[PDB]
Design a binder for this molecule. Structure first.
Ligand SMILES: O=c1c2c3nc(n2Cc2ccc(Cl)cc2)Oc2ccc(F)c(c2)OCCCCCCn3c(=O)n1CCCO
Ligand SMILES: O=c1c2c3nc(n2Cc2ccc(Cl)cc2)Oc2ccc(F)c(c2)OCCCCCCn3c(=O)n1CCCO
Ligand SMILES: [Ca+2]
Ligand SMILES: [Zn+2]
Ligand SMILES: [Zn+2]
Lengths: 88, 600, 49, 153, 51
């Protein structure tokens, strides 16, 4: 036994493959595909719009660091959760 | 794609599963740890990986001695790579069970390896420093007091500081010199004095003098009853210090009375009985010896021999112990009286007074070990300690330059050695009124050359009798050549080296004093009931709950530290040439596709 | 009145001094990339359909 | 004004190093104290032509150790009468050990500390002089009619 | 910033007041022994705000 194994000791939750394309489209500027995912999630229920990426960033804290004032007004006209977003 | 930190390419290449810049031993999990990404490491550990294990130092298996003689420049490269992989903060914080106790045991044996491998000394030394800031930051990411109390009192396998004692036996000087750790202690070293916000120079100066005088009554009160309301008032870290410091000035003041006689008898008897002043000094000596012998019992002998103030106490006790026998032998052997001008040079009463005089000097110079408890005199002892590591080498050179000349002069003047009776006033050697016979033997030629450094040696000691004139010139030349080498070329170098040596210890002169005073304070905290010298001669669920409570704090601390370290990078980094090219390519491809669509 | 004038001048000068003696960093590059990206996406959307 | 805030701590150490040695020598030579009439020219103590009785009492042992810093003390003051030879060696050793600690280890530190202390006050040496001369000038501006001292009565 | 501060003072706001040195009210001596690492952080924040 001259080898050292490796593993994760403090585990956390992970994201599905349907809640990842959403956050990936938010980071690039695509405006016509996010508007469709926001509408399909009101007839069927497969995505929750308050997800959190590996580093604790949600869909409204990615649009503030990349200064985009046209996706913020779209995410606010739908009901999202505004927490400590005025201090950022 | 792991050296240039992109994330899409790595995933894309994982999914689709004779010249290089990398040596033939680098692996992906080993190369992703030299860089310090957190998101790339987490993708390779969710698939199964492995890192080899390095053997201990001085190992002698057949492999370690066979491979080390077939290729010796390739065997000394793999160990450095493995040790650079194992010592990264992200890997330590992601897959360890106790991230604080793993940076203690790995930053201590990366310094031993810095001595047997002279080639990579700097490298190993610098790797040993990334393991001392990690724990300090992980500690100063705390937001309350209950968290500090939980962390500093964790014992693996009662309620004393069971984790602040392990950081002192590893010499971690940044983990015990922090505001919060130095504020949790000051609320225990000043117990019973609820407020120290008083006038600096009068009231707090007088209250201690007031407490000082009460040490005998406090001691006897503790002795007769240890559970009263007057007892239990000495078991406070400050009162014990005050009493022990006060029990010493009385001893050091009951000795000046024995030097200059207040009232005594005339001095003509061989051995007189001991006087009243001497009858009361033996208790202090007996108490000191008993304390010294007791301290060696409940403590490591190796730990004992590792303190440099112990040899002073040993010498003092030996020189104090010899006097009793030397004074009783003369009291039992001799009898009668005779004048002092007819005694012998080796009389017991005369040799029993030199040691008693010498001992007072080694007993009075020990009040310099109290300078660490004050803010003004503290940082001066630590800067003086460095000056004494500079005179050794110049002393080495000076001893050879003196042993060289101590022979030539002795070989030339050993023909004209006169006697004592044929000289005025029957005095022979230096220290007379008229100095003579300074270069006869080898023992005098060593004292003359020493005394000639300060200027207390005259020039007419090189004039010889018998009218011979050629010898005196050679003697004067040999004496004059020795002065230029010692007074003009050496003392002008000590100054120029000490000046440089002082301007490198001025920095970090406050991290090394607080460690010392903390190690001082931690000695009285335990219940030992140490009286002054004179009066000194008369199961599952608990462990489960603790291990369950200790993990949440670690999780929170790790989260905060990682986030802050990621944020600090984006703000304090500059641009370079790699960035310009990507923007040019973006514009280029946009142009090409738009023209393609529009034109056709 | 003197205080009012002094305050005006001081504020204006301190604002001006910043724009000239500050360097760049990584936050700036990302915004430019995003600008080009969104421009591209909307133009392609209009032209292709 | 800054140089005089450096000698205090070294003076503190020096006073202890001197009070330490001022006792051992006094304790050893206080048996051979002669008188004045039995000495040439009726002079007793240092400052005579032929120095004698330099380590008898505690008040003289403090002046001798001071005057021995400049070099005005001779070496034949450690030779005692009564033919005893073992004592003179201990006295000479105690006298020779005190010189290395004071003339070779301490004066080589005052220089090295004052050199560093001087190179930090060179800057802002014009902001602290104009304040002083302004405070000086502001004292005569008021009408006090202060006549010179002689006519002030 | 000068333009951001002017937008928050046109709506009504307020900053607390720190007590004098060596104060001995029941609050300053009660809170200073229940949590002593949180009571020594607020004063620095207020004094960095006021200056
Ligand atoms: O007097 C000297 C002396 C000297 N070096 C000297 N002088 C002075 C001198 C100069 C010229 C003459 Cl014709 C006679 C004496 O001067 C110099 C002249 C040039 C140098 F470059 C120098 C020293 O330094 C060389 C290293 C020092 C050697 C000292 C020997 N050296 C020396 O041992 N004595 C002792 C002799 C006792 O009688
Ligand atoms: O003469 C000396 C002396 C000395 N240290 C010396 N010497 C010169 C010497 C050398 C060898 C011999 Cl067999 C006899 C005398 O030399 C050294 C040799 C090595 C050192 F490392 C050193 C000094 O420095 C140590 C600290 C200075 C202590 C002075 C005591 N010290 C001293 O008190 N006397 C006075 C005695 C009066 O008779
Ligand atoms: Ca001891
Ligand atoms: Zn090996
Ligand atoms: Zn308060």
């Amino acid at each position: 036994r001259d080898r050292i194994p490796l593993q994760i000791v403090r585990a956390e939750t992970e994201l599905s493959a349907e809640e990842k394309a959403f956050l990936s489209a938010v980071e690039k500027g695509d405006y016509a595909t996010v508007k469709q995912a926001l509408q399909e999630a009101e007839i069927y229920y497969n995505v929750n719009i308050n997800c959190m990426d590996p580093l604790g960033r949600s869909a409204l804290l990615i649009a503030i660091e990349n200064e985009n004032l046209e996706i913020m007004e779209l995410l606010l006209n739908h009901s999202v959760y505004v927490g400590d977003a005025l201090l950022y | 794609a792991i050296r240039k930190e992109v994330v899409g390419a790595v995933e894309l290449l994982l999914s689709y599963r004779q010249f290089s810049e990398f040596t033939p031993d680098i692996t992906p999990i080993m190369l992703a740890a030299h860089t310090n990404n957190y998101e790339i490491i987490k993708l390779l550990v969710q698939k199964r990986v492995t890192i080899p294990r390095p053997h201990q130092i001085r190992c002698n298996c057949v492999e370690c001695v066979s491979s080390s003689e077939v290729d010796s420049l390739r065997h000394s490269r793999s160990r450095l790579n493995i040790y650079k992989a194992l010592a990264s903060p992200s890997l330590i914080a992601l897959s360890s069970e106790d991230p604080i106790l793993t940076a203690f045991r790995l930053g201590w044996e990366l310094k031993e390896l810095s001595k047997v491998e002279n080639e990579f000394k700097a490298e190993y030394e610098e790797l040993s420093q990334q393991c001392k800031l990690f724990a300090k930051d992980l500690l100063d990411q705390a937001r309350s007091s209950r968290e500090l109390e939980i962390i500093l009192n964790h014992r693996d396998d009662y309620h004393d500081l069971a984790k602040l004692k392990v950081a002192i036996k590893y010499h971690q000087k940044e983990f015990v010199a922090q505001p919060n750790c130095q504020q949790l202690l000051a609320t225990l070293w000043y117990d019973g004095f609820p407020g120290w916000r008083r006038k600096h120079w009068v009231v707090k100066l007088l209250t201690c003098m007031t407490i000082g005088f009460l040490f005998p009554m406090l001691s006897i009160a503790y002795l007769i009853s240890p559970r009263s309301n007057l007892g239990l008032f000495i078991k406070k870290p400050f009162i014990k210090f005050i009493c022990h410091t006060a029990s010493y000035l009385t001893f050091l003041f009951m000795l000046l009375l024995a030097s200059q006689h207040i009232v005594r008898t005339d001095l003509h008897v061989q051995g007189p009985p001991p006087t009243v002043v001497e009858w009361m000094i033996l208790p202090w000596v007996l108490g000191f010896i008993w304390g010294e012998i007791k301290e060696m019992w409940d403590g490591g002998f190796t730990e004992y021999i590792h303190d440099w103030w112990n040899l002073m106490d040993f010498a003092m006790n030996s020189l104090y112990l010899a006097t009793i026998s030397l004074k009783i032998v003369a009291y039992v052997k001799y009898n009668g009286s005779r004048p002092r001008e007819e005694w012998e040079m080796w009389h017991p009463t005369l040799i029993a007074e030199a040691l008693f005089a010498i001992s007072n000097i080694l007993s009075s110079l020990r009040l310099i070990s109290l300078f660490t408890a004050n803010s003004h005199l503290g940082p001066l002892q630590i800067s003086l300690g460095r000056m004494l590591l500079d005179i050794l080498k110049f002393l080495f050179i000076y001893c050879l330059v003196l042993l060289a000349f101590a022979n030539g002069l002795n070989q030339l003047y050993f023909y004209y050695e006169t006697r004592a009776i044929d000289e005025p006033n029957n005095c022979k050697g230096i220290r007379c009124e008229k100095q003579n016979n300074a270069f006869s033997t080898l023992f005098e030629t060593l004292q003359s050359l020493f005394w000639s450094v300060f200027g207390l040696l005259n020039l007419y000691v090189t004039n010889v009798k018998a009218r011979h004139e050629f010898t005196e010139f050679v003697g004067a030349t040999m004496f004059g050549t020795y002065n230029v080498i010692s007074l003009v070329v050496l003392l002008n170098m000590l100054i120029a080296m000490m000046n440089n040596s002082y301007q490198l210890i001025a920095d970090h002169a406050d991290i090394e004093w607080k460690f010392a005073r903390t190690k001082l304070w931690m000695s009285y905290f335990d219940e030992g009931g140490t009286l002054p010298p004179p009066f000194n001669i008369i199961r599952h669920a608990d462990s489960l709950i603790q291990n369950q409570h200790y993990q949440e704090v670690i999780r929170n601390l790790v989260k905060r530290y990682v986030a802050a370290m990621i944020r600090n990078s984006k703000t304090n980094e500059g641009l370079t040439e790699e960035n310009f090219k990507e923007l040019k390519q973006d514009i280029s491809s946009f142009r090409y596709e738009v023209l393609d669509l529009l034109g056709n």
